[PDB]
Amino acid sequence: PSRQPIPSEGLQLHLPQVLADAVSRLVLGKFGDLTDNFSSPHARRKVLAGVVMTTGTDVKDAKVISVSTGTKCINGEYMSDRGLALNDCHAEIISRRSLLRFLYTQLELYLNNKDDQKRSIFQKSERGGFRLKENVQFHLYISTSPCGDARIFSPHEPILEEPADRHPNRKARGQLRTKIESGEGTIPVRSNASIQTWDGVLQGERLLTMSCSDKIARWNVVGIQGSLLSIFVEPIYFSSIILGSLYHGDHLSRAMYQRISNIEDLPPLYTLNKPLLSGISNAEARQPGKAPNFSVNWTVGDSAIEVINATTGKDELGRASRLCKHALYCRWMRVHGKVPSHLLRSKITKPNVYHESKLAAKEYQAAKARLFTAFIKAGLGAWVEKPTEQDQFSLT
């Protein structure tokens, strides 16, 4: 009973185990193609993640959208005030950023010519802005349970026998947790007071990054498109979360949504999303050797993968990633001009510095507050953000 798939909604559109095994095969497969059958230099991974899109029930109408690896976060000294760094390179966190490029691309594809609109996954929304066509779903694959609430208790395979949580009501369950710089495990936020500072970090204060478990729970409320893309499009959710290993149904479902079911007063179109949760039929084996300092990423359409030094947030020659704040902002800005102002979901105008533009997404920003509040009232801690200095930059 512990390691069994957890169905999603009220009308069931795919077979659970078939999908899980499908997306694990597809992503792990496409990761093979990118690495000349795992023989490549940067093919050594510790954790693998990816996003799969589906257009319909035919499980060969599936497309691998993104593939990524990584287990590390940026060093404190290497934070970039020009937004050129990858602050978090845990596999699944990167696949979401990889997904963002594909969404921007799809927006670009729509506003190119009327003949190309039919090829784009987006369409106009009666409410203003853009929405997905009625049959598009996205699915998250992680080769292992996400760090934090889904993985911290029992980081090892269940021994089945439905070895449910013998102590499900400890204060420590459902707690928000942060990756800590220069230390292992993931730690509660309560016991580590909040509000980070730029200079505080530069001095030696350990950089705190939210756990992947908490980040996805977040994706299950404000959606995966994030603030900037939410100005163009309506909130998008993962339909499924598939784990290639370390699956504990009870733990993952708490961490992914159950713990914030107290959330109220979400803005229109926003909701607490409860995706399909599942392990795969043949769980992945634990990967050999020391864990690599680099984090790989790819998005469908790309000619090559990108290899990032997780320590620094840049590549080997010190170049900014295609996934960093500064690039994503550039894509956003380029599309913002190609989109007519009667077609925006939010018409509030702000200067063109990063933090300020994110603030134009009032509803998304609102949803976030409902989310932070949910965790707090549940006694699960206050969310921890990067120093406010991190997002104060323009496009040169």
Place this chain on the structure above:
Amino acid sequence: TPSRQPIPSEGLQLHLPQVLADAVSRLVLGKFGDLTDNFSSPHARRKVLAGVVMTTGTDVKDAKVISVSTGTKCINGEYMSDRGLALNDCHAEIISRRSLLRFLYTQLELYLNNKDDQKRSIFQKSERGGFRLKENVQFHLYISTSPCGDARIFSPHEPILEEPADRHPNRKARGQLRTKIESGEGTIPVRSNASIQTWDGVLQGERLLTMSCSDKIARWNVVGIQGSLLSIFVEPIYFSSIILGSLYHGDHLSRAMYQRISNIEDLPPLYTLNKPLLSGISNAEARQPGKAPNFSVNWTVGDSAIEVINATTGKDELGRASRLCKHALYCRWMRVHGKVPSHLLRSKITKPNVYHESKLAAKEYQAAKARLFTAFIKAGLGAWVEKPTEQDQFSLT
């Protein structure tokens, strides 16, 4: 890196920048060792180390380590003292300056203690009145990392967006005033539309605001390191040098220390915007991530051992007041004020014998303070935050 190179001073150049830096860097750290049974003591665990070195002449070994201190945290708001027994700010460099104040009081006492001792005192009578420094004495500030606040806000693994010298095509003006956040080693900008702190208000739990060291040192580079009370006896003293053991970026530091308020006008006589020598050291400390110790060490030449203060409370572990608190400093000043004949005061002892009122006796210093506050507002850099006026109304014995 053009970025990691010394910026010579607009003061007196008596030593070579780089020889001097490595000199005071090596001494303070050496003297911090001696105080801690060679770094083996419990209290040798620091995050930040600071110190003051004095020089008497051009020979670069005629130096004396005057003060040594450690600390990265501030008092908790709830724990402030209405009788001035608490140390509101225990940051390494802030603490070094207060210890230096003690060295200043001792040297004044030394002068008016014995006629023979006057030749041993760093002070001399001044023709303009009161006391002034001997014609070659300089003080040098060492900090093991760039001071918190504006001087530290930047990416140390990226080139500088050199401000295009032709009206920022967007908008700019960095250098904004920033405040230490209570229960943290860090800093946040000041609300450009803010409130003012109140005594009963903070004590309940409202944010205590203490200005960042970057903003404090800039203040030292205008009104001097001697503070208000001591300016009644002696003339303004400035650091000739500021040496950094890490996170040194010349253009950033020069900004935070003086360049951002170069718009300063109508300073009183003897007061000026001091532009000291800025420099890093050759073998920089590496960033050591981990907890910042909750305690603050301090020492002043003449002392037998160090004093250790709980930064959160501003007192020591047994709740005894530090030698650096307002009340202690007042005790030293009052001792001197009676030993000094009234024609020799730089301002007339007019006002009553409560702390705040005596600070107002320093008219030229107070004036200097106001021009400084005004420099920051007109520069579009935020308004300075002063503690509620209750902090400073208390008396002695």
Place this chain on the structure above:
RNA sequence: UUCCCCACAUUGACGUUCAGUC
């Protein structure tokens, strides 16, 4: 069930050494 105490385990940095690539 929850917490406490003690013991034993589990899970990103640092240092030492060894092997290679540009």
Place this chain on the structure above:
RNA sequence: GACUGAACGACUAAUGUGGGGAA
């Protein structure tokens, strides 16, 4: 120098199991 791959040591602050308690 940077990156890469194996060994050993020592840190990190949560978390697990057990024994004993407690509500």
